[PDB]
Design a protein around this ligand. Structure first.
Ligand code: GDP
Ligand code: GDP
Lengths: 391, 436, 436, 391
């Protein structure tokens, strides 16, 4: 039940750092991976009696200690171009990235699958990120692949071409991942904004994320009973192969208060269309300080599509070890049809630019024609339409 | 590991600007601009690997610009050699004797056809000793014969042999208050066609604007081309700073990154730039500087960006660190007053570099792809016509390789470029169709 | 890993200088002097750990000076709090109400005897959060009551409880063109005794010299204590730069290193300092600056180092990197014209720091242990006598703790110090014997 | 026959870098210690079939790859004070330095001895350096200890207090080392000065040194026959326990030319009093491109003390692998009575300052009284007088 984690790109490794940070403190390991005095060998790697190293590969990193034999320094070239990352520049390094990964699973008794932390708006995390997602499937067909993908939002964007990279990558996340957590900047923004009087900075957003990760990953690295393995994540949240795009929330930012906050619109990390959107599959996980009781109480709060059975469709878990800084916290993974919003948004943006030949050429001269791009959009459009009609 | 940048400076103006640029950058990085040496035992400030090359291995080691200087007349290169000490690589200072007689034709297909070989040999060399080449900046004055002629020639062969490499042209446009040949509009229009078709982006330096500026904001009774040239450097230095020095969250912004953001369409890659602070070489506050960057009298181009549309902007600060909050806050406000298009809703790059230049503790450069550039290009086309209409001096060019048909087409291209941008104000979809 | 330095500023002048110092250093390192914050995601320039402390753990983290401000009157600390935002640690700004009435006695053994406790508590705190404490700089004006009184008191307890820690006092001497109490010579002479016996070295800031300077080289019609204070900062910043920023071959020169080199004997630890460039806040070349450092009208002390002997020198540049060769060459030449002793044949420290201040792209500070300091000390002793001779105001001090015998001894010490240095010109062996 | 190398202080590690630099290139190993395609396991450590790591401990280092488990980062405090390094500050870290060393010899089948590269004028390399030299003997009594010590010279000094540290350390080098190579700055200066038109900088000097090291160390790491082990160095150069202070030269800066240059006054790295000084024991070692012939020819050049036997007293060796940058080079280790000069110099300087209570107090308040210092001088004075009367 070992999970290899792959972080790619600036945003990819930025999350890596932050997450693996508390990743240790939670499991109580030192800056170097020792006991400063549970089944954790799922994320960390036991080297010797009391030594552990993070089961993770840092791909395309450009600035603490991970196995620098399993981390690849970035080679200039990706830019903000997806096509550039998935081809010209990715090619030069995909074979290597892959060996570095495979050599990390070699020292893996029973591999479960992978986790990928990256940004779908850049060029490294999107382009190269997609290429990896692809060759990762074509190599470990039986393994599960999960994603922590940051979606871009104009209210904190640095590239004009983002939505293009967004759509392109979303296609590969759709065709190769068993599930993806969409960390929406538009949401991460708003959250951080009203949480800290001044205009947010990538770090602030980066925080919310780090927590969301640890909390989502928790159940996989702790003794609990809910979402023991990525596989359970699937059977519990993906009501169908294609629709595997989830949202996650955090609480907080009492218990009735926690369970209330955990399932509070404003508390989620995604712009889901809470109005004409309906639930499909939920999952709460509280950790810290009588849970298998208020379950039915909550399900009456949430409104799933009609065809779903009244009671059930929602499972609640627990972990005694809460994230540092809290006595006990929440987290809610929800496969909600409102997630269609996020896609539709990206589409709309895409369309304007694309229909005017916005920056289309930088992509074509890089091995990504407008038709290929259009296909990418048309596909993601359907994916969203899909979620929409399911409501 | 960082991207490499080679700077080929063609012509006279190009080379004079280039010389200044290199001395300045040398000083920013802590390298003696006459010996290529820095303090023993330590390496130059910032990412010197970017524009400089390491020679030797100890500390007696020197650093040498990734630059090539080409010119059909010795007057300037010869002087650079005199004034630059052992700075540059001697075999990278290509020069000739007869000159080009202010003839695009001569430089494009004739006398310049002879230097191409040596010049290319040098590129191949500088291109190879690059861990990661990531852009070639051609610095030249599109108004004369060599810079316009060889300029175009060199950019075209540079995109045929190589081509996976981005090429940013920094073209100095000619003006009345400094003209040197009645045919400046011929040469320019001719070189424009190539700039338009073979470069990845052209940063335009309009001398008229430089003159006014050096005379108004710097208030110089009668500005010399040297005065004008200093401003061009302040910018080149300030633009390239994002490559030579490290940021807060990024270590370097690539010419590629920078360009893929500013250039939405192939024939819409003609950039403008503004600077601040513009204080005569004889202090202002962040807020004022940001505000002034967008004044109509601060762009190094004879136009009014504010009366046009911004297709894509890029503000590049340096010196700004602690005061960042306030700085963003201001530029943020500015961003609202800016005229944008409907088809490129958002495109506003912002970059910070801790290290300041040798001139101001805090400064900033505006790099913008604005439509009022179409106005500048028109002015050129007009004058081109005042001459071509009466066929003045045509013979010099005709009897040197060119033809009437060839000349007309070039003028035609220049037109397409101009209309293309105008349309762009309204629609990108249309601006496209105008490209044929 | 680097050494830590805590700066306790006692009194009014001390605290006013301290406030300026801290704002300046804040700006040099890229830290907002009102919030202790820097650009999100990155750490402040240089070795901030040196003078600043890290608060928090993310990026919302702030940096706070390793400084303690003490004063028996609220007028100044209260103002610092007003003007410094959340910069300093509030519990590190000790203040009181009654004041010291220009009375060394009050501050030394009485009203100041009450604040000692709180002040010490704070040190223990700041001393502990230091990975590696390596020096405490006591900034104060030896001319008044608090700075002179508590100053001495605080330095004496600081060397009893701790003591393994070096203490450098930066004592501002009083002058006619700015005096505030007819008894300045009493207070000074009194505090001197402690400075002499309990500090590791005293860097003397003679206000008379500062006045002339601010009026001559900076040409200010009538200089304010604020004008005078700015110069003191320029130095403190420039001296401490060798600790806050990294060198070429060294990462930091310790106050300890710096002092063990300048101070040959226990009672011969009274330093002088000179600065360059001294250009009014309204450019010079390295060579000139080095030359000017040794001019008799550039030292922040009313004397002529050149007419004396240099027991030990220390030139500290910053901004100088590429141009180092020329710079060394000059200082090297200067070194020959300098008057040295026979018993300390060679003692000439030289330090470089790439990072410049916020004022000059290139600058330098001369820190010298010269004998003409004996002349300054004499002037003090004289005036002390003009008063003590007639016993003027003695009563205020007598009836406040002191005695005639105690007062005479102190005056006696001051004498020993003065003769000690004079002799030093001739022999170190003798200068020793004069210490008892 | 394994030799552990210990580098202490700025100057100590500065040499380390430079030496280990060509240390690889000579043995043809890569930047990381691999074969880019002799008995070398004496200096490098074979980790795996084709992997080697430098047998060296970096003590008190403050900025490439050595075992960062066997390198100790400096802890602020030494200053320019010997007393400070040998006591207050050295104490805090001597125990650790020692374990780091002992743990390096644990993986040593048959340890020969140690090599120490340091400066006797600073406070770290002198103070702490001396403390190590001491505890190194009190722990490995049967092992041989050799030193590469840089002596300070006013024509390139940065501290007033240098000669004090010089003498203090020289005492420990006298009582605990089996031999020491005095790299005189006064000499290194003059050499570099007349070799490079402009005034020399620590790097230039640092160069000459690096070569001197490799060349001296050569015979210990190469198949040759002369000076196979530190022990032979002794029996071949130390004519008596106390007098173990050597000088080394380099050539160049033909063969008759090389053998001429190698034994050329101006070519040595020490201010030995070539006039009224006489040889005691020499040793030449040429490497690169008929040596056991011109031996007797050379000995007639050199003038040893009378009591030494005509032929003999000089041995010549050879190594096929020359230092990078040369076709073939020289090097001459000479135990010459003129070396007394260097000491006398330091003494004189000491005296002036000391007799005036120059900076004596910084030493006393640090656990080194003037008497202790005086003893140090008086002893080194004798050491020199010794060499002098031996002539
Ligand atoms: N900014 C600037 N413009 C120049 C300079 N020299 C010439 N020009 C202008 O640019 C045009 C080309 O001049 P030059 O570079 O000498 O042409 P070339 O050497 O024949 O290619 C002229 O017509 C001038 O208006 C210069 O040093 N700086
Ligand atoms: N350079 C300088 N000297 C000052 C300043 N204020 C006072 N002095 C001088 O130093 C002496 C002590 O003043 P102050 O620091 O107010 O004394 P205290 O607060 O009673 O210890 C006076 O007699 C003045 O000549 C100041 O701001 N700067």
């Amino acid at each position: 039940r070992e999970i290899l984690s792959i972080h790619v790109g600036q945003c990819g490794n930025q999350i890596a750092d932050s997450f693996w940070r508390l990743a240790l403190r939670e499991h109580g390991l030192t800056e170097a991976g020792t006991l400063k005095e549970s089944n954790m060998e799922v994320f960390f790697h036991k080297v010797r009696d009391g030594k552990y190293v993070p089961r993770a590969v840092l791909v395309d990193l450009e600035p603490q200690l991970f196995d620098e034999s399993s981390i690849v320094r970035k080679i200039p070239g990706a830019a903000n171009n997806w096509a550039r990352g998935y081809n010209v520049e990715g090619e030069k390094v995909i074979d290597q990235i892959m060996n570095v990964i495979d050599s990390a699973v070699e020292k893996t008794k029973g591999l479960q699958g992978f986790l990928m932390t990256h940004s779908i708006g850049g060029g490294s995390g999107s382009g190269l990120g997609s290429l990896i997602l692809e060759r990762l499937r074509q190599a470990y067909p039986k393994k599960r692949i999960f994603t922590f993908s940051v979606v871009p939002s104009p209210l904190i964007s640095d590239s004009a071409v983002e939505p293009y990279n967004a759509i392109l990558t979303l296609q590969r996340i759709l065709d190769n991942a068993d599930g993806a957590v969409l960390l929406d900047n538009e949401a991460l923004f708003r959250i951080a904004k009203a949480k800290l009087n001044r205009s947010p900075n990538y770090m602030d957003l980066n925080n919310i994320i780090a927590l969301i990760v640890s909390s989502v990953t928790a159940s996989l690295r702790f003794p609990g009973k809910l979402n023991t393995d990525l596989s359970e994540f699937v059977t519990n949240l993906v009501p169908f192969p294609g629709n595997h795009f989830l949202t996650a929330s955090f609480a907080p930012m009492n218990f009735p208060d926690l369970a209330r906050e955990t399932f509070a619109q404003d508390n989620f990390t995604a712009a889901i269309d809470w109005q004409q959107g309906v639930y499909l599959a939920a999952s709460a996980l509280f950790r810290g300080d009588d849970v298998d009781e208020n379950m039915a109480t909550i399900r009456k709060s949430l409104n799933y599509a009609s065809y779903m059975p009244a009671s059930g469709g929602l499972k609640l878990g627990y972990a005694e070890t809460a994230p540092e800084g809290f006595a006990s916290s929440g987290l809610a993974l929800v496969n909600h049809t409102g997630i269609a919003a996020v896609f539709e948004r990206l589409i709309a943006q895409f369309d304007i630019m694309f229909d005017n030949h916005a920056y289309t050429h930088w992509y074509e001269n890089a091995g990504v024609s407008r038709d290929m791009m259009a296909k990418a959009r048309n596909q993601i459009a359907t994916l969203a339409q899909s979620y929409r009609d399911a409501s | 590991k960082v991207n490499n940048t080679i700077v080929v400076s063609i012509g006279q103006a190009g080379n004079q600007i280039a010389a200044s640029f290199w001395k300045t950058v040398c000083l920013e990085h802590g390298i003696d601009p006459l010996t290529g040496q820095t303090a023993p035992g330590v390496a130059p400030r910032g990412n010197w690997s970017s524009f400089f090359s390491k020679l030797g291995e100890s500390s007696s080691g020197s650093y040498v610009p990734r630059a090539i200087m080409v010119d059909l007349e010795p007057s300037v290169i010869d002087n650079v050699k005199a004034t630059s000490g052992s700075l540059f690589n001697p075999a990278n200072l290509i020069s000739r004797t007869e000159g080009a007689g202010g003839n695009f034709a001569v430089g494009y297909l004739g006398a310049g056809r002879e230097v191409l070989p040596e010049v290319m040999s040098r590129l191949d060399y500088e291109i190879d000793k690059c861990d990661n080449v990531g852009g070639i900046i051609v610095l030249h004055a599109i108004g004369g014969g060599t810079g316009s002629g060889f300029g175009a020639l060199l950019i075209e062969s540079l995109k045929e042999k190589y081509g996976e490499i981005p090429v940013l042209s920094c073209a100095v446009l000619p003006s009345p208050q400094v003209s040197s040949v009645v045919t400046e509009p011929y040469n320019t229009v001719f070189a424009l066609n190539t700039l338009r078709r073979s470069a990845d982006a052209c940063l335009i330096f309009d001398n008229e604007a430089l003159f006014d500026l050096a005379h108004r904001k710097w208030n110089i009774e009668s500005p010399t081309v040297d005065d004008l040239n200093l401003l061009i450097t302040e910018a080149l230095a300030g633009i390239t700073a994002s490559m030579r020095f490290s940021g807060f969250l990024t270590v370097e912004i690539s010419l590629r990154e920078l360009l893929t953001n500013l250039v939405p369409q192939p024939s819409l890659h003609f950039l403008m730039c503004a600077f601040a602070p513009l204080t005569p070489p004889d202090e202002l506050g962040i807020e004022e500087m940001i505000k002034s960057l967008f004044d109509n009298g601060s762009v190094f181009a004879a136009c009014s960006p504010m009366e046009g549309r911004f297709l894509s902007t890029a503000v590049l600060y340096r010196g700004i660190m602690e005061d960042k909050p306030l700085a963003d806050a201001a530029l943020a406000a500015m961003r609202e007053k800016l005229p944008l298009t409907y088809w490129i809703p958002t495109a506003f790059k912002i970059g910070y570099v801790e290290q300041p230049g040798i001139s101001h503790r805090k400064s900033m450069v505006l790099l913008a792809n604005n439509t009022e550039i179409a106005r500048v290009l028109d002015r050129i086309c007009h004058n081109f016509d005042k001459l071509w209409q009466r066929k003045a001096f045509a013979n010099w060019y005709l009897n040197e390789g060119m033809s009437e048909e060839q000349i007309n087409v070039l003028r035609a291209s220049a037109q397409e470029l101009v209309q293309s941008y105008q349309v762009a104000e309204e629609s990108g979809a249309k601006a496209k169709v105008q490209d044929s």
